[PDB]
């Protein structure tokens, strides 16, 4: 159930396992736990050592170079909550340089309330990618898990699937398991943070992590808000006071803690706002008999004496030592060598201070985007200045954009000069505004505020260029902006045009194809766009190119990013035209839409034409041998320096000349396709070739504006009995026993018939064949037999067309006279 036994305040264990045996009788650690620096240790020194009683840790857990430890599943088999009240360099779980460690094994870790997890330099640690930290820690983007065995090698991670839950991480579902035999317990979304039981039932509203029986505060394992009498409560009822943000205590316990410090060497506890806090905040003073903080009859701030008069803020834990401070009796150095935005936890610890007796220095703060976390910073006395007599030292801040919101924020620097160098995203406008507000305008000397490094990567030209004449064509865009001239019009070396296609409106500022535009002659400067793609929206804005000025402000002018879309036109040719004739009169034609729509495609045009049969087939003798009828580079850097130098040299010569000279004396079938890519075609002749003309056309009513077609050919299937001969077989016998055979031709064949074959066989004799071609059939009106032996024959006739061979006609019997 809840926490039994002792409380074992924060402890550190080193150099052996001898002193760790004092964690046996306590379940919750009221502080931080550190197991580190164990070299004379062996893997057999941890099997018999286990701490099932430990449940929750308040500050953090640190593990640094403990040899022989392979898994935490035995040391802490029931650790479930790390509150993270006090972090170790903005981290709540640090595992650093754990040699011989192979798996985490913290299979009960459910919630990490505050902080992050860092795992680094563990050459044998695996089962790291199989942990869903999003279910454990809220802000998972701040975790730093690098240089392990999960990426250096390919160590296997076997989560039993025949039960470990699978959750999506990036784009795939993977099973979650701490070890080879323990699955990461995942609760349903109905149990937000209170946890679930074995059967998946939500615990009490005041619960956290795990519980024995659902919907019962007294059967939980880790309290979400506070602990009291084995029960989790939202707030401490009277006469109990909050203590360490995790449990409720009476006045006697806090008094004993206070007296144990007063009568000894410390955190002399007091009472304020129904809490037993270490030090009373600003504006209150502890009394003699009672410990409750009465408000003072005077504005007494909380001074925080910084040792050595210089404090470096580099993490959440360093800033937290200034929590509740109002006046700082020292100097602050803000250096977050990071990559994750800590302003959320920085404004909670800082931002309550008003005065700084020394200097404020912000150096190499990569992650900071603004100094707005100083909510109440008003006075910088500068009684102790940075070397070189500086009271505000900003340097090498790669993402600093805003110093303060000067509309409502007041600032007053008493002494010391300013310094701003290598702030690529902090512009001179903010610096000068802060100079005016602070009152140190006439205090800085040259090169204290840099010019080629402050804001060199930020667009703050603070002057608007207005486009004056824009119109678009097929593949060109015409641009015209109002002319711009600095006071020295020769300083304008020309304009620079940035363009980029954008499907949607909101586009970033500052790809980005560049073209250099000369200044006009003193006619708007303008420029003509070329090499565009039709029906595409582009982002356009112009940024001036002025010569640098070391003395005064350099200069600035730029235009808002306008969006222009070029017009539509005829699309491309439809792709992949394929035609298939599944039936004797039906053809299915399939195609792909053109790759260049150049607008919205509205309709398609398909044309057909029956191909006339080749003339030579009607005038070829195919009974002869040989009768095989077919069965149908950015501008390099030194270069631009050359134009810069030449343009400056021309002005230098002009100025020298002017100074010297002047002395101041004293029809075919078709159809319309609607949003379809195929068609079934009716009314087609059987076994005939067709020519298809296919177009994709995006405009019908206001005249068609569309391109050339795609051509393809297809042949329909033939009929069954098209080639078969119909009609009775008619024969004539002359005086000289000449047999003249006649038969009705197949009026409607599959295209055309090339030849006929007649098979006459006298009874008992062998079959005789004779080919009759088109010309023979026309000349003889069928067949003519000369010189035949007496007897009775059997005559069968077949017709051969383009489709193939037709069926033979019924046998016919004729008898020639014997004489």
């Amino acid at each position: 159930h809840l926490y039994p036994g002792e409380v074992c305040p924060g402890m550190d264990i080193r150099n052996n396992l001898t002193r760790l045996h004092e964690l046996e009788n306590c379940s919750v650690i009221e502080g931080h736990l550190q197991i580190l620096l164990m070299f004379k240790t062996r893997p057999e020194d941890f099997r018999d050592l286990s701490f099932p009683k430990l449940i929750m840790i308040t500050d953090y857990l640190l593990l640094f170079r403990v040899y022989g430890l392979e898994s935490l599943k035995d040391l802490f088999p029931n650790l479930t909550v790390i509150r993270g009240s006090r972090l170790f360099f903005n981290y709540a779980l640090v595992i650093f340089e754990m040699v011989h460690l192979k798996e985490l094994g913290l299979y009960n870790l459910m919630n990490i309330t505050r902080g992050s997890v860092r795992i680094e330099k563990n050459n044998e640690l695996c089962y790291l990618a199989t942990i869903d930290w999003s279910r454990i820690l809220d802000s998972v983007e701040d975790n730093y898990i690098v240089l392990n065995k999960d990426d250096n090698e390919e160590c296997g991670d076997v989560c039993p699937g025949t039960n470990c839950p699978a959750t999506v991480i990036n784009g795939q579902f993977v099973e979650r398991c701490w070890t080879h035999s323990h699955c990461q317990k995942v609760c349903p979304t109905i149990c937000k943070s209170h946890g679930c039981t074995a059967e998946g039932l939500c615990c009490h509203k005041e619960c956290l992590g795990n519980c024995s029986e659902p919907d019962d505060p007294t059967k939980c394992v880790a309290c979400r808000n506070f602990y009291l009498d084995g029960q989790c409560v939202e707030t401490c009822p009277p006469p109990y006071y909050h203590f360490q943000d995790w449990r409720c205590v009476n006045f006697s316990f806090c008094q004993d803690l206070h007296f144990k410090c007063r009568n000894s060497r410390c955190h002399q506890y007091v009472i304020h706002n129904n809490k037993c806090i270490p030090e009373c905040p600003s504006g209150y003073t502890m009394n003699s008999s009672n410990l409750m903080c009465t408000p003072c009859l005077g504005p007494c701030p909380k001074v925080c004496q910084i040792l050595e008069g210089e404090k470096t803020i580099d993490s959440v834990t360093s800033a937290q030592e200034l929590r509740g401070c109002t006046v700082i009796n020292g100097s602050l150095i803000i250096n977050i060598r990071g990559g994750n935005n800590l302003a959320a936890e920085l404004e909670a610890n800082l931002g309550l201070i008003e005065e700084i007796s020394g200097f404020l220095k912000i150096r190499r703060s990569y992650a900071l985007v603004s100094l707005s976390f100083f909510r109440k910073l008003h006075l910088i006395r500068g009684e102790t200045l940075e070397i070189g007599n500086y009271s505000f030292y900003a340097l090498d801040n790669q993402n600093l954009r805003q110093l303060w919101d000067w509309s409502k924020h007041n600032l007053t620097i008493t002494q010391g000069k300013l310094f701003f160098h290598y702030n690529p995203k902090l512009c001179l406008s903010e610096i000068h505004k802060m100079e005016e507000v602070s009152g140190t305008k006439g205090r800085q000397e040259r090169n204290d505020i840099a010019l080629k490094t402050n804001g060199d990567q930020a667009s703050c030209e603070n002057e608007l260029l207005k486009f004056s004449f824009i119109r678009t064509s097929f593949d060109k865009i015409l641009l015209r902006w109002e002319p711009y001239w600095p006071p020295d019009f020769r300083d304008l070396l020309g304009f620079m045009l940035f363009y980029k296609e954008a499907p949607y409106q909101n586009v970033t500022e500052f790809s980005w194809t560049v073209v250099d535009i000369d200044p006009p002659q003193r006619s708007h400067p303008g420029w003509l766009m070329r090499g565009l793609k039709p029906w595409t929206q582009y982002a356009i804005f112009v940024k001036t190119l002025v010569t640098f000025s070391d003395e005064r402000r350099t200069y600035g002018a730029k235009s808002d990013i306008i969006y222009v879309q070029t017009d539509a036109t005829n699309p491309s040719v439809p792709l992949d035209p394929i035609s298939v004739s599944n039936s004797s009169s039906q053809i299915i034609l399939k195609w792909k839409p053109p790759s260049d729509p150049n607008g919205n495609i509205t309709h398609y045009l398909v044309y057909w034409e029956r191909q006339a049969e080749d003339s030579e087939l009607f005038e070829l003798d195919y009974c002869l041998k040989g009768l095989k009828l077919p069965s149908r580079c950015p501008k390099t850097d030194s270069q631009i320096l050359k134009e810069l130098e030449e343009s400056s040299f021309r002005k230098t010569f002009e100025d020298y000349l002017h100074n010297v000279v002047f002395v101041p004396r004293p029809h075919r079938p078709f159809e319309k396709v609607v949003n379809k890519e195929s068609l079934v075609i009716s009314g087609l002749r059987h076994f005939t070739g067709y020519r298809i003309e296919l177009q994709a056309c995006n405009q019908d009513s206001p005249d068609e504006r569309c391109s050339v077609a795609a051509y393809v050919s297809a042949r329909t299937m033939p009929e069954a009995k098209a080639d078969d001969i119909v009609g009775p077989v008619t024969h004539e016998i002359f005086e000289n026993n000449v047999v003249h055979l006649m038969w009705q031709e197949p009026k409607e064949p599959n295209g055309l018939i090339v030849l006929y074959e007649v098979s006459y066989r006298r009874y008992g004799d062998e079959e005789l064949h004779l080919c009759v071609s088109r010309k023979h059939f026309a000349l003889e009106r069928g067949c003519r037999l000369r010189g035949l032996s007496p007897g009775n024959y059997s005559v069968r006739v077949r017709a051969t067309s383009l489709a193939g061979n037709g069926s033979w006609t019924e046998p016919t019997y004729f008898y020639v006279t014997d004489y």
Binding site: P487, D488, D655, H658, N659, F662, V663, P664, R665, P666
Partner: peptide, 21 residues
């Protein structure tokens, strides 16, 4: 020189009379 007076600073009508006969 005239450049430092006029192009960098601001010249008035009377100042330009110093450069004439």
């Amino acid at each position: 020189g005239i450049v430092e007076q006029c192009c960098t600073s601001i010249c008035s009508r009377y100042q330009l009379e110093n450069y004439c006969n």
